[PDB]
Structures are given as C-alpha cells and as structure tokens.
Amino acid sequence: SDAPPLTLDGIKDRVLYVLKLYDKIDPEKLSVNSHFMKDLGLDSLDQVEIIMAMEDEFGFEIPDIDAEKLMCPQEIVDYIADKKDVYE
Amino acid sequence: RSSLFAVSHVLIPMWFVHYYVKYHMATKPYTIVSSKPRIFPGDTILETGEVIPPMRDFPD
Amino acid sequence: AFCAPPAYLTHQQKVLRLYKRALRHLESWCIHRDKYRYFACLMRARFEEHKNEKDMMRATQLLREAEEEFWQNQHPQPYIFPDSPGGTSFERYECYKVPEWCLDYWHPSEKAMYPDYFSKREQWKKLRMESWDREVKQLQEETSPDGIMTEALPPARREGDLPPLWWHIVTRPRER
Amino acid sequence: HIQPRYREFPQLTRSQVIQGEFLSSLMWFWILWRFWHDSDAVLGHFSYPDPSQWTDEELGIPP
Amino acid sequence: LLIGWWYGRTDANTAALQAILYNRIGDIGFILAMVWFSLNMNSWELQQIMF
Amino acid sequence: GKMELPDYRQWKIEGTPLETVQKKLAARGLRDPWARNEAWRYMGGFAGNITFPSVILKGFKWGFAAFVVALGAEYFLD
Amino acid sequence: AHLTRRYLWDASVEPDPEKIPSFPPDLGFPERKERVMVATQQEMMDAQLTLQQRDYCAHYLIRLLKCKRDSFPNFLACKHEQHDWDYCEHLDYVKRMKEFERERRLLQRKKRRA
Amino acid sequence: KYKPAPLATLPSTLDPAEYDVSPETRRAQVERLSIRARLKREYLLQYNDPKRVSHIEDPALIRWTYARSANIYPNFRPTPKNSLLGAVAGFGPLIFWYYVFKTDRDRKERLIQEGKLDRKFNISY
Amino acid sequence: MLKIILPSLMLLPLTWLSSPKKTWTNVTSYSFLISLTSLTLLWQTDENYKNFSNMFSSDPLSTPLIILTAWLLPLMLMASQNHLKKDNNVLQKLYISMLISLQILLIMTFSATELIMFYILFEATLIPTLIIITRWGNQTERLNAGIYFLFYTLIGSIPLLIALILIQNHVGTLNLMILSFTTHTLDASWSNNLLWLACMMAFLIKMPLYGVHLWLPKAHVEAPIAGSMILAAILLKLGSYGMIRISIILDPLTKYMAYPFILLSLWGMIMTSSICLRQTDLKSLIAYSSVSHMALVIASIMIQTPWSFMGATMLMIAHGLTSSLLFCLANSNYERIHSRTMIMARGLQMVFPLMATWWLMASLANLALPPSINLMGELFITMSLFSWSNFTIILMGINIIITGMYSMYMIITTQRGKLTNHMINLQPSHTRELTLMALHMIPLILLTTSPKLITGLTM
Amino acid sequence: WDKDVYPEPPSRTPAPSPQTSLPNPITYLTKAYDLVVDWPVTLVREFIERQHAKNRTYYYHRQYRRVPDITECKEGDVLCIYEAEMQWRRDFKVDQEIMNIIQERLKACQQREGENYQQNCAKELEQFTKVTKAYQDRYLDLGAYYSARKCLAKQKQRMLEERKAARQ
Amino acid sequence: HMTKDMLPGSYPRTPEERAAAAKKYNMRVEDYEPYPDDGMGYGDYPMLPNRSQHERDPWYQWDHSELRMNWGEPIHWDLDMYIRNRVDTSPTPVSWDVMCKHLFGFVAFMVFMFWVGHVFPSYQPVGPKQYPYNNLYLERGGDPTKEPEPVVHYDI
Amino acid sequence: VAGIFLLVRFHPLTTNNNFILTTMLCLGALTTLFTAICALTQNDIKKIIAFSTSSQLGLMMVTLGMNQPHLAFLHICTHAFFKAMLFMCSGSIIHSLADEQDIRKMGNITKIMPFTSSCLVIGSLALTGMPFLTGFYSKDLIIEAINTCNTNAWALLITLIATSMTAMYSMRIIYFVTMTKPRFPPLISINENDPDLMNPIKRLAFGSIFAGFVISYNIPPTSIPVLTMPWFLKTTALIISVLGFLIALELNNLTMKLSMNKANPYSSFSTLLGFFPSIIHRITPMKSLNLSLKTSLTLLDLIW
C-alpha cells in the first residue's frame, strides 16, 4: 500500500494540470515559467487560491511566508522538491 | 514447520511443567485446591459406590 | 521553514493570511466540495468588494472587524494536514532523523561495509575545510556598517565559491 | 504490485470484493436464521397481564 | 512506552505522562484498599478477604 | 514505472451539482474558476448516489437465498 | 403508571415497594396455603448453587444444569429445560405482581373506610 | 466577545498593538529583528564551522540557572508579607496536621482503653 | 569480621606499591573478592546473632549495610576513573586510599557493639568525604559545601556524645544487648526529653530532616561521583542504624516526643518531591529525591513497628542502589557535556539507545514499580502509618503522585524528545559505565527475588 | 504431608452420564496427554528416585531443651535473660508458623466450598478467630523491640484487670 | 568562561545600570523591565510576557526547537512550566469566563438531577422476593444449634 | 476493562453496600452521556472510537452498580471483537491513504474498499445492538435490567439517551466515511489485498458474529433475568437505536442544502470536550508548579 515516490516531471505534470483546470485567466497556455502577474496578470488572491489548490493536490501545507513568494510553476516545483527531498 | 515448532515450543515445556506440577506442587498440601464438582440427584458417586435418590414429584 | 519573518507584516500580507485562514475554516465547516466552492466564491466577492479602496484608516478598521468576525465564526476543530503543526504526524520521524556527525564515531568494522559511501563523505569534507574561510569574508565584506541587519543571506559571486552557511541546509536528513 | 491510478476509480481485484460480499451475506444469513428460530428474544415470549383484570377472589380483598 | 513510540512527537509524551498521572491517582485508592485488607484481615488473598 | 495523466478535456461541469452551484452563482452574478478540478470526482466510477440501504443490505440477496435453502433442507430432514 | 399515580396523584393511597407484606396475610384469605418447596437443602447444596439462585425454582434449575453438563459438546440441547425455568420464574414474578395489586386494593379499602 | 485571561491569552489579531503603524513601533520592530539576526548569525558561525570538536554554549541558559539558583539570597530582603508567607507556609500546615493526627490517635486510644473497639483479625502492625 | 577488615587494610600498600598501570586493576579485583568474602555474614541458620569478639557483632540489619558497603567500593573505583585520569599517579592513589578508608570505617561502625566506637567512626567518616569533596570538586562552592556538611554533623553529634557519657555513668556500659537486657522505663521528665533530643538530632541530621536538609544537595552537586554515591547510599544510613539501635532505651518517650519529626517528615516529603519538579540541576533533583525517600525512613523509625522497621531497611538498601545508579547515569553525561543542566541535553535514546534503558529502569524503581524492594518498603511504611492514623494515606498518595511525575520528567527531558543535533562531543557509551549500571541493577533483581535477606531484625 | 495437620477432606466425584451420542474431546485429549507427557516424565522421575534410593541420606529435626523462663530470671542477670529471650523468640516464630498454618487451612476450605463457604466453612473460621484472639493477647501491641519482658508486662497488665473484674 | 560582569546581579536603581543590564541580557533598554523590588531574589532579571511556547511560530526553524527558543534570547524565569510539555496559554475560541460557567452548570445540574431521581426512583410493581428456609437463614451464615425467627411465604 | 474486572472480582463485597452500588449507577451513566455527546462532533475516527469505548465502559459500570457483574463481564468480552475490528479497519483506511484520520477528507469507501467497509458496517451494527451480532447477548439484558430493577430514574434515562447517541455517531462514521463522495486527494494507491490484513479482520468478524451465541449458550446461569415486561421495555434498545439512526440520517442530509453552519455553544461544548481538559490541565499545573517553585524551593529552602 506504500505510495510511489515523486519525480520532478511528475510534479511538473500535476502543477501544469491544475493550472490548465484553472479558468479565471489561464487560456490553457502555460509554459513552465508563465508568471502569474506579468505573463498572465493575476491577483495575489488568485495566487492564494493557487497555492491552496497545490496543497489540496499534494497533501501538505505551504507556510504563508513562503507562499507569498511563489509566482511561477517552476518556483512551486522547486519548493515542493526541496520539501519532499526528490531526485536522490 | 508447524510440527517442529509444536515439538520444540510446546512439548519440552509441557514435559518440564508436568514434572514441576506432579512432583513439587501436588506433593504439597494446599497448592492445587480444586472446587467441588456439581452433583445432582441420580449422580452415583464412585469413591463410595453410592447413589443419591431423586427429587420429589414436580407439580404441574 | 525556509525563510524568516520580516520586522513587520504589511497590510497586504495580513489580509492575504486572513483570507487563507477564513477559507480553510470554510472548508472545515462545509464538508462537501460544491458547498465549499459556492461559499468560497461568495467570500471572494465579499473581499473584492473592497479591493479598490485606499483609505488606510478605514481599511485597518475593516480588518480589525473582520478578524473579530473570524474569531466568532471560526471552527474550533479545523482540518490540519497530518505533517503540519497540530497534525497527527508533526514531529513523528524526528526519532529517525539522526544527524551526520554520528558517523564520525563509527567503528572501522562498521564502515567496512558501505565503503563507496564513506569515500564520498570524506571528499565532502575536503569540500568544506576549503570552502569555509571565504564564506566568512563574504559576510564580513557584505556587512551593512549602518547597523541595520536581518536574517537574510547572500549567494556566492564566483566560480567555485559556495553559498555561505550551507553545510546545515545541505546534509540535513530526509523527511520520510 | 498494482498500478496507481490518478483521478480515476482504480482497478479492483476480485478477492477483496468477494470476501466482503461473503462476510455480509453470512451476517445476514445468521440474522435471518436467528430471527426465525428465536424471535422471542427480540419481541417477547411472556405476556404482561393486565392489572385489575384479576378477580377479588384471588388476591383476596374483603368488602 | 507504547504511547511515546514516536518520542520526537511532543504530544505523545504529554499523553503518556497524562496516563501515568491518572493511573497513579487510581493507585492511591488501590493501595488504600490493600492497606485496609492487610490490617483488618492480615491477608491479601480473595479467599480470606471473602470473610 | 512511468505515471500518466489523462487529458483535461474531459473534466467538465456539465451534468453534476457543480452545474447547479454555477446556476446559483450566476443568479448572484459570479463564476467559479475551479469547479473543473473538483469535477474529477462526481463522474465516472465515482458517479452515483450511495444509500444507507445500499450499505446495510449488502449481501442480503445471497444471505436470504441460503437461508431459504437451509430452511427447506431442515423441513426435509425433519 | 404507578410512577405517576404515586409521585403526582395521591401518594398515600399507593403502595411502597419495601412494605408490601405489611398488612396481615389472611385479611381476605381463609386457610391461606403456604408456598411449597420441592427441592431439598442437601439436593441444592451438593449442586453448588448461588444464594441469589437457590429459590423456589432450583429444582428446574438443577434439571437444567444436569441436562447441560450432559449432552455437553452439543449445546442448544437445553431449550426444553430452559423454557421450564423461565416459566417458573415468570410465575413467581406474577405472584409478586399480584401481591403488589393486593396491597394497593387494601389501601383502597383503607381510604374508602373513611 | 472574547474576554482574555492569563491562561487563555489574547491572540495577535485582536491586539491593537498590531496594526499600529507609528514609527515608534516599526523602528522598534526593526531593531528587535536586527538583534535577533545578529545573534542568529553569531550562532551559525559556530554551528556549521568545521574544526569544532566541542558543543555550543548558552550564556542565556547559564544566566537563567544562575539566577534561579544562586542569585537569590544576595538579593533577598526581609519584608512584611515575606516573613508572613514564610512563617505560614512553614508552620501552619504542620499545626493543622498535628491536630488532625493527635485527635485521631487520642480518640482511638480512649476507644481501645474502654474496649469499645473491634480489632478482629488484626495480628500485624 | 577481621577476615573482612584486614584485607581492606592491606588494599592500601597494594595501592601504593603497585605499579602506575596495574593499581586500578588489582585493587578493583581484590575489592570484588572482599565483597564476595563478606557473604559469610549471611550464614544465619538460627535466630541467635553473631558475636566474634567483645568489639564486633553482626545482625540481620548490619549485614546488608556491610555488604552494600563492600560492594559499592569497586563501583566507585570504576566510576572515579575517567576523571582524575590525567591527574598524577600519586593523586589518584590518594583518591583510592580515601575510598578504602571510608570502606573500612563504615564496615567497622556497622559491625560495632559500643555506641562510643560507633560514634568515633561515624564522626571519622568526615575526613575522607570532606577531602574528596574539596580536593576533587570542580566548582568554587565545594568549600562552603564541606563547611555545611562537617558542621551540621558535628553540631548534631556533640550532644549525642554527652548523652552517651550520661548513660555510661548511670548504667556502667554502652554495650548493646546489655542496654537491652537491662533497660528500664523512664520518668517522662524534661531532662529525659532533652536526652531524647540529644540522642536523636545527630542521626536526624545525618539523614536529612526537612528543615536541616541544606547540606545534602550542596554536597552532591559539588562533589565527584564516588562521593555522591557513598553519601547517597551509606552516609544517609548511619543515622538510621544509629536510631534503630538507640531507640530501645528511650522508651516510652518516643510515643509523644516524636510527633514533630513525623510531621516534618510527612510534609517535607511533599515539599521536596515538588522541588524535584522544578529543579534544573539533575544532581540536586536526585538529592531532593533522596531526601523525600529518607523522610519515610525517619517517620517509620519514629513509630516503632515491625512492618515499619522492615520497610525502613528495604527502602534504605533499595534507595542506596538506585541513587548510586542515577548519579552515575547523570555523571556519564556530565563527562561528555560538562553541565548538570538537564534541559540542555535532550533527544538522547537515539545515539545512546541502551543507556536509555538503564535510565528507564532506575526510574521505574524510584517510582516504585512492582515487583521491587522500593515498593516492598513503601507499602509497609504506608500500612504502618495507616495503622498509626488513617489520614497519612493522603500525604502518602500525594508523594506517590509527585514521584511518578518527576521521575518521568527526568526521563523525558533527557531521553525522549528530539536531539540537540549541535552536540558533536557525544563519545559513545563506555563498556565501563555500562558495567557500572549493570552492577547496580542486577543486585536489585536478586534482592527482589530473595527479599528474605533484607527484612531486618523483626522478621 | 500429614493429613491430620492438613485435612484435605475427601472428593465426591460422580459418574459420567453421557446422555447423548456425540463424542467428548476432553477424554481422548486426556488419553493422549497420559501417553505423551505422563509416561516419559514418570519414567524420568522413577530413574531419579532410583539414584536417590541407591544413595540415600537422612536429616533430623533439631530438638531444643527447655531452659528457665523469665519468671525465675533475676532483674539484671543476663546469662539467664539471654537464654530466656532466645527461647521466647523461638516460640514467637513457631507461633507465627502456627497462625500461617491456620490461614492456609482456611483459604483452602473457602476455595473448596465456594458458594457454601458461609455454612460449611465455620469450624475453620472459629479456629481462626480463637488463635487470633490468642495471638492478640500474647503479641499484639508489644512493638518493634518486643521481648519476653514486654510480654510479661502485658500479661500482668491484663491479669490485674481480670482480677478486679473477678472480685467485682 | 563567564564573569561577574556577564552574570546577573541586583536591582538596577539607575539607567546607568538598566543600560548595562539590557545590553547584557541582549534586549533593548526600553523593552527591558526588571521585576519589582519585593526582596525575592529576582534582582535584575528580565520580566517577560507570561506566554507559553505554543504561542510561538511552529514553522520557524529555531535553534532550540523543542523549546521554540533561539540561542541568545533571554529565557523566561518560568520556562520549566511553558516548555510545551506543560502549561499552555495559547488562546481559545471560547472564553474562560463562559467555559468555566458551562462546565460548572453541566456538572451541578447533573448532580441535582441525580438527587431528584434518587428522591423519586423508578421500579417495577412487584413484591419482594421470597426465599424458603427463613430467607436461607442457615446457608446465609446463621447458626445451626439456634433457631431463627420463622417467616412464612404464602400462595398468591 | 481492568477496573471492571477488579469490581467483578470484588462483587462479593459490593452486594451489600447501597452507597457504592449507587455511586456506580450514578457515575457510569454520567459517562455514557458525556462521551457520546463528545463523539457526535469530533472529526477523527480514532477519537470517535475512543469516546464510544468510554461510553460502553460507563454502561458496564452501570450494570455493575445495578448488581449484574456477570453481565458486565460478558459485555467486556463481547465488546473486544468489534471494538478491535473497528480500529483495525480504521488503520487499514489510514495506511491506505496518506496518514489522515479526519473523516472530512475521505469517502466512497463502500466502493473503493469493500472489505473494510463491510467489516466496519458489521462492527457498527454489533455495537448498536443488532439483534444477534455479539451486541444483543449483553446489551439487551443490560438495558432490560436497567429498567426492570429499582434504580435511579435519571440514570435510567441518560443511559438510553447515550445508547441512542451510539447509533448516532456510528451512522456518522458510516455516512462520512463510506457513503459520500471522494473528497480525499486525487492520487490513489489503495491496496488491501494482503493476507496479513485480510485474515485478521475476517477472523475478528467471525468472532463479532458468533461469540455471543457460543458463550451465552455454554456459560452457567449465575443470575436470573426478567423475561416478563411490556413491549415498550422489551424492545426499547432496538427501537431507540433505530430512532438514533434515523435522526442521524436526517441531521446529516441537512449537511447538504447549501445552508451555512452557524456555530453554536452546544456543538462547541461537545467538540471541546466540555472544556474539562482545556481548563483543568491549565489551572492545576499552574498552581502545583508555581507553588513548587516560589514557595518551597525559593521561599523556604533557598531563603528562610
């Protein structure tokens, strides 16, 4: 029943997946570095919602101090990798 | 496996325990004190070849 | 768990964190996803109704009132993710999170196995007694002489230099 | 052994379902056998006589 | 010893010590009973105590 | 092992309570940008309503069947 | 029920569970017979019964224990006996209920005598 | 509305000290953070420093132990309520318990002398 | 007895004219052989007691103290070994000689027949202890600690001497069992009340009463490990032996001239078990534990019942062993961290997973986990005091609770959190100290299996 | 084991009346036990008793001459007081064992009778009460430092009151 | 190694003393506040908020994590009771004044109602049970040689 | 069950003390109610099960006070089967998911995990009192004696209120863990096809089904029960369990309907445990410790 380990490409897939499911702005065009305010023009409230969706997806919390600095899927993937200790 | 485990983890201990009981716990007076066995009318005891008589006519 | 709080939180940060906590407690209260989405959209409308306002005094007042409303309508048994404070796994593997220096006391007949491992551990030290002196100067020289200081740290600006004070952020044990 | 599934209803082996169905069917068979043969234990087997339906001859009360 | 298996968790230990505390509070009465019986019956066995 | 992810072109609000919630949020004049995420459930193998009868009367079919079988066998054997 | 009839209505014309045999027994019974005992003290003591249990039905209880110790590997073979014991205990309960009603009727007599 | 207590304190949200924007507040916060960061830098220049064979000391812990242990009597001063707390705590309960035990013992002894007691099976003491 | 004392006297030359490499080994081995030979005293086939001379004697109460004294020696040798390791050969030979002298004098004063010989030895026990505490301590308050210890003891001991002279004059001897076969009742006068006070205060100080407990925590905290061990195990027992021996002639005064001390003991028990909750020094915590345990011994001697004396003896020996064990356990860490502060080092049981067991069992004993002699003593003291008066059970239960609290506190703030990962100097556990702990524990198992050797005079 | 010291009344065991046709495991299990546990252990104890029989040894129960009592023992002569006190301690220990025997005799009867211990376990309870009264009159309130002299003082402090009662 | 100038001392009666005390304890001379002078050994030791260690941030990577307390930070005189295995001052949605009232009310009402149900019990309408041989006088202890006060149990 | 075993072992002495039997009957019942209440607004399976255990223990203390020790012990023995299988299925579900015990993040177990769902339903029914699943053979007799004896007429009521809260929180478990939609994370690695997990539960379930029969039909009759009573006493346990199930169905379907959840003091009380811990574990330590420090160590020892 032990669940399988994580992979960087897996986290990429899942993050881009959630962001594609997102509707308010994202016109299904999201490169790994689709900055939310510059490249997509989102609000900090939308960013809050995004981080909470990432949490509900992966099963753990992002401290608000560190979530107030995530604006790119790549930054999200990097934080999650640092937390889960992946790519041994 | 079941059988070898049975032997080496039940029998040997069971032999030691039977020895201990029979020769250090029943040789002493009040170490194994059983309660008395229920007896009912008609139960013919065997230590005296006795027979206790049955009960009275049951009204009904 | 990776940065340090700033000397003071700004109104923006306060409001964002209030929004996050309010939504988490809305989730706690509403068990079903449809209900959660409904009332989350309602709450975000309540919020956006006062996003283009700028009077700082009235803003702080609205915030001081919203925090009281939150304290009055908060779920007392909210959902906490397991590995987070208040969760059923917070500080559960600290029993197995043994540090690295515990291997300097190992016995030759213990490192006799894993020999390829301990050879790397060695040169990871050679990479440390050399990279130490320049990590100090980079702090000495990058010091604010005007007194001001905070809990930040700079990277290395060279080819070969390493981030100052790395050995403990690197080398730390898995979470498992 | 199994293959993880994402946002889908996973593949279900036959043992884990047949065994649960068997246990449930056995529980209900037991309930039915019992409720058939020993219904009293949940309903009653000894009525509760109506007080004052007796006669003053019994429980003698002089006038 | 079992509530405390994860001796890094600072709440399992609180729970363990809670259990210890309450069960000592019960041991107070247990020892009171043992003392009363040892004095007024010169015994600690169910058999004598049944008198 | 390499994991796969199905296309996002199938998780649609249509035919679920998310759609009724959308009706209500439109009556009030609003939109939900996330419903398509929560809509992975509510459809597929996870579709359908489960009932307290559904969970309590599980096995009852074959239970009752074998009960009647044993009853007939008992009547036979006397 | 008696609960209401005592705690809300007249509480002095309703019996008290601890004073049931208070009045004389034969105030309405001529040559009131006794309750018989068809089980002997020895027959009841050699069976190792309990003092909450060696009441007027210990004879059927003796038959039950007998037919149980016998036919043992096959329990469920002690139903016809269990029924008899349950019935005698039910009849004892009936006698107790009738004693209660007797005393209540005598309280009615005392309240109607004045 | 939430009434704070010394055991269920007031949160940070409802603390009007928070949301204060006065410079006499923000400057103080910045100075506190600067002190905190200076101390953390000092401590991390010792944690990760190689060539360290020993452990790290805690002058704050040392100060705390020295205060709770040995800096007491040099600052002690007899005062009212101090002499009184001491005398009470020291003697009162002893007097209470003395009279409890003495009453009980005297009662038991007079009972035994009169023979009005039941000491059945007491053959140990 | 002389076959026990002469070899202990010969351990001295052995120590001094042994080479600088084999002195520890040889003296420890021969100390173990002495502990072995001391078991002749346990050959008691009759209710008659032993009398080898007009000067020596043994009883079911003095034999266990003597054997514990002869057993603790090699343990103290082993424990005082890591420290004073660099110190000069001459200095460490001095240390060994101090230990051996303590052994000999304690054996003598437990095997003595005359109160005045008992006195001169119970007062000669000061020189070696003072010297060990002042010459080998690490702080600067060990001097004041020795002052306190020495002078509390002497101030308590002078009137005892005067009372002994008064007796030697009224009666013609101070010999035990003659003071028994000739004892008389008294007049319940003030002179005899002061005689009681005199005879008692020395011992009520040497085993700390609540109000004069202000020499034990000092001495422990400031003394080395062997001093701590002997102080906790035997020097706290000299008073108990002395009172159990001197209370036979003071009848019938202790029926009413004992209330104050029973009160002080039953209250200071609580008031020290509570300090064991909020003390920061592990050594002072264990000292206050010793105090809270000796309070029971005092209150049980005061009431003079067989069960009481039995519990007193059991708890004496058990607490000796357990306190020595706990002190050595704290010393194992001190040798590695040089700080008695408990909350400093935490999260052990990760790098020292076995010593966390010894830590645990020493705690299971102190909190009286059955089956154990700590409990076989506490229980009987409780029963005796309940027969005395039923209201003692309240304070007994309070003390039980607080003990169960602070034992587990000491366990958890050292072995059951998460590690202070910044501790690079945690040299793994020495076979020597593991052996110390094993030698402390195993005898407790054996005395729990055969507690007939530990009941005492009455039984 | 002397049955007079330790009664152990007889056992009324009844006849097995298997009023059925289904077997009983316990019987065949007991037979298997007799065959695979008893037989060999019995043989081994027989062998050990053989070795004993061929190298027997005897040991005797020590007798103790009676010496003067405290009554004929002067008020300060210790050569006699030692003998008397040793004798008293000896008898005190034997009395301990007597009382323990009575209690070991009562527990067995309680366990045996079971629910009939309130009617069939009375003479043992009476012996217990009597020996308890005696132990109390002899040794109850002496103290840790008990001795023949304190026992004598107790005896006299009792007899003077009994004499007062007698005369009035 | 430390020194009498690094260790604590006595009550500061000048700002020349408050400055050194606060700079030693590593606080600022404004936030520093010594304990009142009631002759109790405190001396110049900081007086700090009576908040526990639960209040602090769990997400911060402290130095002393189990204590949630940094390295040179001044330590609360009552840490041993706030070490997070002990007293918790963290706030509560409900308030002391109302929670105590609710608990006391629940308990006291339930006790009062126990007494009400004791004054007015519940039972079934039957007479006492009947045991033949004088309520089993012999079996129930009794005395064989003596006789009991005979009692009778009638039919119906 | 250790204290209850103690009290049954010492039942020969509680038989003649109507002050002990009366504080039993008036205390055990005070827990059946006070814990079930707590078990109606908690979100953790483990806490729910523990509060239910405490309620059943209060019930056994009640039947001890009413002088039914053998019945209390029979309940002790018929309770272990299902109160162990429940923790068993709980732990199965948990280890299948990512170590989460909060029911608010699980669902559809009836379909994604048939085995543990079936076993959980069996345990819940046995606990509620279904006519023959090891619950009946003890709880029915207990709840018959409770009203057939002369007793305390407030315990006789709160005992049954709690006997209903039993089915209430059991239905809560069933509905929030095995009937609603999968509000758990999206990654799914469920696996319950390991014999070391399937066989133990199968075994404990056979137990939970047949142990009451096998025992009650072999043990001796050390107490005469009362099979003479009205239907509204003979069927009260079953009826009230059913009513609890139905009330729970209603109040849980009300969890839907898009009506926000206005917090209330009743629910806050039941959720925060009546504040017993939140207040006691804060005053008593503070007093004890401030005394230990400022009075004994400081004022007496180091000062005076």
Ligand SMILES: CCCCCCCCCCCCCCCCCC(=O)OC[C@H](COP(=O)(O)OCCN)OC(=O)CCCCCCCCCCCCCCCCC
């Ligand atoms: C910091 C603490 C204070 C330290 C300074 C100590 C100051 C010392 C006190 C000053 C001197 C006062 C004592 C004078 C002694 C008087 C003589 C006496 O009391 O002896 C009487 C008694 C024997 O009398 P008896 O045998 O009956 O017949 C007549 C004599 N053939 O024989 C006896 O009773 C012997 C009495 C010896 C003196 C006992 C002193 C009090 C004992 C209890 C306290 C002990 C602690 C140290 C003293 C504390 C202060 C008193």
Ligand SMILES: CCCCCCCCCCCCCCCCCC(=O)OC[C@H](COP(=O)(O)OCCN)OC(=O)CCCCCCCCCCCCCCCCC
């Ligand atoms: C009809 C009847 C109704 C009334 C019945 C009344 C029955 C008597 C009730 C007495 C019990 C109340 C006192 C119990 C004290 C419990 C203290 C405690 O709980 O310690 C644990 C506590 C942390 O626990 P917690 O608050 O749950 O924190 C969890 C965080 N997630 O915090 C701690 O870790 C503190 C650790 C121990 C602190 C030292 C304690 C010293 C001893 C003081 C308590 C004993 C006082 C005597 C209690 C009464 C018994 C005589």
